[PDB]
Amino acid sequence: RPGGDTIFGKIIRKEIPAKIIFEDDQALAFHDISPQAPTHFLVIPKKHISQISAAEDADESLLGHLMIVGKKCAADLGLKKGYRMVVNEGSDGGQSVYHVHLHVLGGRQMNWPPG
Amino acid sequence: RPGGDTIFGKIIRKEIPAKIIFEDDQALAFHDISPQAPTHFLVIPKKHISQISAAEDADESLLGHLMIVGKKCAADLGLKKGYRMVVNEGSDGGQSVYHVHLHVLGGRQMNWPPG
Numbered sequence: 001r002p003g004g005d006t007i008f009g010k011i012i013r014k015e016i017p018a019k020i021i022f023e024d025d026q027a028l029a030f031h032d033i034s035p036q037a038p039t040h041f042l043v044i045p046k047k048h049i050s051q052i053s054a055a056e057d058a059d060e061s062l063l064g065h066l067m068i069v070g071k072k073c074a075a076d077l078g079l080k081k082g083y084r085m086v087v088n089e090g091s092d093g094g095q096s097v098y099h100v101h102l103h104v105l106g107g108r109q110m111n112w113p114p115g
Numbered sequence: 116r117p118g119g120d121t122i123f124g125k126i127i128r129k130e131i132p133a134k135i136i137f138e139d140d141q142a143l144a145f146h147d148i149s150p151q152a153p154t155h156f157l158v159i160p161k162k163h164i165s166q167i168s169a170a171e172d173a174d175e176s177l178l179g180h181l182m183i184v185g186k187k188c189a190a191d192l193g194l195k196k197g198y199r200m201v202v203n204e205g206s207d208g209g210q211s212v213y214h215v216h217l218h219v220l221g222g223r224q225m226n227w228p229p230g
């Protein structure tokens with residue numbers, strides 16, 4: 001199915017709502033349900049890619065688009081002091097949902113190490 | 116100057132060495148000098164882009180290339196159990212060096228929140 005077989009497929013098909021902050025033909029951005037910062041949203045491709053380690057060379061422009069969408073949303077949400085972008089792979093990365101997703105976190109000082 | 120006026124410009128011009136693990140015409144990957152995980156390396160564009168918030172639409176494919184390079188390096192370094200990718204913007208993101216850089220961390224469980 002367009003959008004894949006994860007939570008995020010359901011969100012892309014609109015079968016379940018999400019607090020959508022951006023949509024184009026390539027990607028969707030929405031607030032995270034378990035926020036770790038005052039602003040915490042996700043940017044996902046509409047194309048099911050299960051994980052970054054499964055992305056192909058021809059996916060570069062889409063992956064970069066996630067990042068540009070994230071920049072735009074961050075500006076729309078007033079993240080003038082900055083933010084952190086995170087992509088988790090696999091079990092050591094803390095990936096729960098096997099559809100690529102870019103986290104964007106801000107509205108507080110982000111610490112180091114990044115987990 | 117090609118490569119810009121930061122620490123990372125010096126690295127790109129080879130004026131100072133780094134432990135280089137990948138090089139192509141677009142990007143460079145090298146181990147971080149202050150590692151936060153058993154594997155911790157950086158992927159940078161050779162084009163000076165100061166921060167993600169300064170990237171333009173035409174930079175998408177280069178930004179995605181950083182991510183594909185990171186995937187390749189992670190595989191070369193044996194990160195079979197996964198990893199975390201991080202890009203810091205500005206002061207709240209913890210950005211120190213104003214040349215875009217993608218962190219890739221693995222070889223341990225990464226925690227949550229990501230800072």
Ligand SMILES: Nc1ncnc2c1ncn2[C@@H]1O[C@H](CO)[C@@H](O)[C@H]1O
Pocket residue numbers: 007018030031032033034035042095096097101
């Ligand atoms: N239905 C949902 N809407 C928004 N974010 C979600 C949903 N389900 C899981 N998440 C978020 O997806 C991320 C998966 O990395 C988590 O940070 C989690 O909180």
Ligand SMILES: Nc1ncnc2c1ncn2[C@@H]1O[C@H](CO)[C@@H](O)[C@H]1O
Pocket residue numbers: 122133145146147148149150157210211212216
């Ligand atoms: N000369 C260098 N070689 C490799 N990594 C470096 C160098 N200088 C700074 N760094 C790393 O650059 C990152 C900037 O975010 C830091 O994690 C820091 O440790």
Ligand code: NA
Pocket residue numbers: 001002003004046047048049
């Ligand atoms: Na798909």
Ligand code: NA
Pocket residue numbers: 108109110111
């Ligand atoms: Na804080």
Ligand code: NA
Pocket residue numbers: 116117118119161162163164
């Ligand atoms: Na340049």
Ligand code: NA
Pocket residue numbers: 223224225226
């Ligand atoms: Na750990």
